[PDB]
Design a binder for this molecule. Structure first.
Ligand SMILES: NC(=O)C1=CN([C@@H]2O[C@H](COP(=O)(O)OP(=O)(O)OC[C@H]3O[C@@H](n4cnc5c(N)ncnc54)[C@H](O)[C@@H]3O)[C@@H](O)[C@H]2O)C=CC1
Ligand SMILES: NC(=O)C1=CN([C@@H]2O[C@H](COP(=O)(O)OP(=O)(O)OC[C@H]3O[C@@H](n4cnc5c(N)ncnc54)[C@H](O)[C@@H]3O)[C@@H](O)[C@H]2O)C=CC1
Ligand SMILES: NC(=O)C1=CN([C@@H]2O[C@H](COP(=O)(O)OP(=O)(O)OC[C@H]3O[C@@H](n4cnc5c(N)ncnc54)[C@H](O)[C@@H]3O)[C@@H](O)[C@H]2O)C=CC1
Ligand SMILES: NC(=O)C1=CN([C@@H]2O[C@H](COP(=O)(O)OP(=O)(O)OC[C@H]3O[C@@H](n4cnc5c(N)ncnc54)[C@H](O)[C@@H]3O)[C@@H](O)[C@H]2O)C=CC1
Ligand SMILES: NC(=O)C1=CN([C@@H]2O[C@H](COP(=O)(O)OP(=O)(O)OC[C@H]3O[C@@H](n4cnc5c(N)ncnc54)[C@H](O)[C@@H]3O)[C@@H](O)[C@H]2O)C=CC1
Ligand SMILES: O=C(O)[C@H]1CCCS1
Ligand SMILES: O=C(O)[C@H]1CCCS1
Ligand SMILES: O=C(O)[C@H]1CCCS1
Ligand SMILES: O=C(O)[C@H]1CCCS1
Ligand SMILES: O=C(O)[C@H]1CCCS1
Lengths: 279, 274, 274, 280, 279
């Protein structure tokens, strides 16, 4: 029974993430679409067209988003953030909570830019992922220097309506980016390959995609609702000498586990590397 | 009414001049190319087509309105110092050299006359069959009509779109080097056909036709390349068995490696220039 | 004046009917296709084009002069037992099924009427953009004009040549499965473009255009694919660096592996049929 | 012929494998009398020295004697020895000398800098050759230095063409030539050893396998040199569809055979550049 | 000063090998081109066009080649040999020496076919390679049951005019096929790759191809003219710590030697496998 009646939300940037969050927020019923505004310099985007059909207000002018909004999501690519902050810094007011969703971009770099215009900008940094669009996101956030305690509580309330959400220290966010930020892409890759495996063994592609996705969804839910180690859940599937343990062996023979560690590491390191180039 | 020149009379200049004249947008007599070796195979070819040839880059500049630089990247600075005093208000200088930045070209030419009109492009050899892939970036002093003239000319020999200059090194790694990746693949596919009993000539023809048709399908489709792949393979069938052996060798990762390596080498060469 | 039927209304039947009608060689109303699932996506598409649809394979046979079999290979014997008593002296039966031999088809149809006119072909999905690659072999009772009619029809949607039947399983591994190899390559090349900073849409477009143009160059050239590769790479340049990383992963061997695996699976499936 | 009646005196500083191979080639070509060649080394107990002596080449421990004897003077010592050599006999280089450095990686610039401290216009040529000059099938490139006369390059090409292929190049290609044709014979000997092992594994006597493998390589190389066709086209002409050769080419491809040869040319070229950076 | 004045040579098959041998024989001066006849069912072949320009007599009819010829080379693909022998078996005469160049095809299988028409066919089996076209071939031959001692001597004389030639026991020929029969293709592959290596390091392709080919030619000649082991010749190239030994290491790290053994083995095994399918 959650609903933010006095809250206006804006998105600077109207792409994949702004669409996913706006769709998730409106489906959760915590925000009416007409209380959301998004800005983009390209109104011929498929996400812009989708946001319009939801009822979200659209404008080319970032200043209009700022003037409309209380909670302001920065949903542009990381290298665009400093340009955005230069553009609307003079328009940030005491009432604004600035939530940066940009990969890698530090609270410090945002606060430095905005502080040149008005002291004490209220800044929150978050890392989320596209499954907020089906209200099953994974979101972490860190509060900035001037964020009030009620600001973090409000953001956790809002972002919990579209999936898991918890506060972290900011120095964990680049690693979260490599795990759950990039994570859905690892899963989409895995599901494409599992479906290819099903097709190879005789299944129609449509059925293979449905079954592989249901298997992943079910297993993830089991782990979330269980207190047992994933190794123990794995042990429950494989009967001695059976089909599953034969398949697990071929995964191990290819270093399957190491590839996933490699992936989380590479996304995290690239996230750190990009920000060091920014600074 | 346009007059076009090429500094350099090698593979790219031939490919572009053959495409332009085949497209009809340019008559061979409006094209002049220069090279210090007038006994080159490509120079002989351009002569048969009707293109004017000269050893003197100054003559090419004097006749051209649009001037293409089609020499190797390390030669661009030498060329710019030889012809810089000959550039005029009318000239559009189109650099085709891999890696060479608009800034480096504009710096050299500005020592002689301010506001040189510079465009940088990355194209590829299939312009010779009017199926090239071309991107271009406009310089500080290019007029808006300069970019439109450029896009009109290069669209006649393939795909053409404007990009920001900071994308061009990556384009080089993808569509600039791309034809070589395809020629390697076609040689190997033909070897596979021969191993399974096909005459070499038929294998080359079938492999090339298969790649051409698939590329055309993807260009004409709004569907994802993975969806088009799913349409080929029946469950349990021959295609999905072959796709597995490609995946087992990391086929996808090799092509990613290639684009990266070409792009990185392009960036590395230009850092050496600067 | 020709009437064409398809038994099966799936991906291949759609692709061939779209190519035929786009080529102008066949009006959509002269084509009938049958399928047991009239709520298929491809069946809806054929209906929009003007193709006649029916659930009854007998109706397709009754209207067709040329009859394409475009069902999965394990279904061919079932189809031949359902329609065998309906084949006539006028019919040319064109089997498109992977692996299925002319001998197996002629044996089944001969139980009903002697001298069935049978042609086996291997084509691919790019017939839908009239750039298919098709081979065909004529059966024991096909007249000489039957092969010429077949080549005329299939040349309208791509390359077409007659082969001995014992080459068709290898052709399957090369140009039949080939589009899937190209779609995989194009997905990966686009990923490489994105890694180096290109938007995904531009990377897909440039990669596909590069492969299309290179394939067209090879088809229009008498030069060896290795010679065309040599023309792309400058000494020390970006392309030769990328070619090295392809060679280091055994890129060529993977494509040979793929053709072999598809051909072998085709042979294996037909041995299972027999 | 014309070079023979030129009665050239040749010297080698260094009496090792390259000096032996060149001396053997020049004398077998009839361009030089063995006794018009002089070679020096501090180690007069080397096998190459005994072979040179048996040939009739003049041997001396004293590099100055080689210089004074010579009209064309080959520097055939290890790359890191070249600067010591140039310090030692630099004062003995005369205006009549053509100094030909064979040393891997050593630049014309580095040599001219040493020698210019003594006479102002030392005539320097840099070359890269290989051991098959010993059977007059060498592969040789050379670049002319700042003060080499046009006749000096032509004389050098005449001389080195008598023992194989020879062509002028820009100096900045020579490190790459080193990795290809300089080191190349060692790749070929490795390949010939391995091909012979393959012959032996399949049942051939070793002597026959070595002979057939070497003859195969020689004939294939000669074909390519005498053909205007691409090596891939010549390869295509060997393999029938489904046949033995295309099966063998597949297993080469599956091992990255091509990439190994690229790796080798690269590795030798890079090592050549890396040593010279250590020098300069 | 060799010349076979009373010898007429025929080729059944007018493809790559017939062209290479006819070009080699005529360049050696041991045969006039007009004393050579070749037959093929396809007179629109590039090799047929090349043979015509040399002066070689051409016919579509294999029977004409047989009637013209004394020495008859079978230069068709191995699976065509039994069809050929059926076709012209009745036309073999006492004077004919039948030389089969077909990979894998045994003397026994040829003699069995031809003996059904006339006893004691004179059969020689040979394995050669395309460098006979530059008179640097590598050829072995085995004499059949009814070949006279002068027949082998004559064939060794003829084939020695286009390269190395020696007699072997027939059971060595499949292995020779894997080594020197297929060998030129291994070399063309190696030269293409070496040239790519030169281009990568800055050489023009034309120069790189010329230098790589000269290097291989020179090294092979050195080995042929030396009594030393190839390992010893290799040692003479590499100075301690130098460029060559660095390159040899990277070849060894990739198992370069094993790939060449693999190749000879695979060609030999395929040659045996094909013939077992023939029989
Ligand atoms: N897509 C994902 O999976 C997630 C993305 N993120 C972060 O969200 C941000 C955006 O990601 P996507 O939405 O995927 O990017 P996207 O590229 O889909 O949308 C980007 C939007 O920014 C707009 N834009 C460009 N310049 C602008 C300007 N000057 N003012 C306003 N809008 C401008 C573009 O027109 C486009 O609408 C990035 O920083 C990314 O790290 C974080 C979590 C997950
Ligand atoms: N060939 C390709 O696939 C493409 C090449 N490019 C770029 O085009 C340029 C040349 O490419 P290619 O034509 O392949 O090189 P190329 O080597 O075939 O032709 C180069 C031409 O420049 C001439 N040249 C050398 N010095 C000269 C001088 N001082 N004045 C005038 N002409 C001179 C050479 O004689 C030769 O004719 C390079 O910058 C390359 O990056 C870009 C896209 C594709
Ligand atoms: N899709 C491709 O890339 C190509 C496929 N082929 C061959 O074409 C045939 C089919 O290929 P796709 O169209 O991809 O299969 P598909 O599965 O897309 O269409 C198969 C059609 O057969 C219909 N069908 C099933 N049982 C039937 C019956 N008893 N009577 C009539 N119709 C029936 C199915 O309902 C479906 O519409 C296969 O033999 C395949 O080897 C050959 C070349 C290329
Ligand atoms: N061996 C080869 O394959 C080729 C060698 N080269 C170059 O030729 C040069 C020598 O090569 P190798 O003859 O193989 O070396 P090597 O070591 O066989 O002969 C070197 C000779 O230098 C002599 N030497 C050492 N210090 C000396 C000094 N202070 N004064 C005079 N002589 C001295 C040694 O005693 C020995 O006789 C090297 O620079 C190498 O890069 C280049 C082309 C091919
Ligand atoms: N190309 C090579 O590197 C070498 C090939 N060989 C052997 O030589 C034989 C031929 O090899 P290539 O010449 O490369 O084949 P190829 O395919 O170049 O020439 C084959 C010739 O046979 C002709 N032919 C087909 N049916 C015929 C018939 N019924 N009567 C007469 N001629 C007919 C074809 O029209 C063509 O002219 C094969 O058995 C092969 O094993 C042996 C040593 C080396
Ligand atoms: O014992 C096994 O592995 C079976 C149970 C899980 C699916 S297969
Ligand atoms: O894989 C399949 O189902 C067939 C499709 C066309 C070539 S093989
Ligand atoms: O490799 C090269 O020399 C350039 C050719 C076009 C793309 S990069
Ligand atoms: O077709 C082939 O591969 C044979 C040719 C000569 C060596 S084996
Ligand atoms: O010592 C070395 O390896 C040099 C001699 C051969 C070419 S490079």
């Amino acid at each position: 029974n959650l609903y933010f009646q006095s809250m206006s939300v804006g998105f600077i940037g109207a792409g994949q993430l702004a669409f996913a969050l706006a769709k998730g927020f409106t489906a959760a019923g915590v925000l009416a679409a007409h209380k959301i505004m998004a800005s983009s310099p390209d109104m011929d985007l498929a996400t812009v067209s989708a946001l319009r059909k939801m009822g979200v207000k659209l404008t080319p002018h970032n200043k209009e988003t700022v003037q409309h909004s209380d909670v302001l999501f920065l949903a542009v690519k990381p290298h665009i953030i400093p340009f955005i902050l230069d553009e609307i810094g003079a328009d940030i007011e005491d009432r604004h909570i600035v939530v940066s969703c940009a990969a890698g971009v530090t609270i410090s770099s945002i606060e430095k830019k905005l502080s040149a215009f008005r002291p004490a900008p209220r800044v929150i940094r978050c890392m989320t992922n596209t499954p907020v669009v089906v209200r099953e996101g994974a979101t972490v956030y860190a509060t900035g220097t001037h964020a009030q305690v009620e600001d973090g509580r409000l953001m956790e309330q809002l972002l919990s309506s579209v999936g898991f959400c918890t506060e972290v220290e900011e120095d964990l966010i680049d690693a979260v980016t490599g795990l759950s930020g990039s994570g859905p892409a690892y899963a989409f890759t895995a599901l494409d390959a599992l479906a290819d495996g099903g097709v190879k063994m005789g299944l129609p592609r449509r059925l293979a995609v449905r079954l592989g996705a249901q298997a992943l969804l079910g297993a993830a839910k089991m782990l979330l609702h269980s207190e047992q180690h994933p190794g123990q859940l794995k042990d429950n599937v494989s009967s001695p000498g059976g089909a599953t343990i034969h398949a697990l062996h071929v995964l191990e023979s290819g270093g399957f586990r190491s590839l996933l560690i490699n992936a989380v590491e590479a996304s995290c390191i690239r996230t750190r590397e990009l920000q060091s180039m920014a600074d």
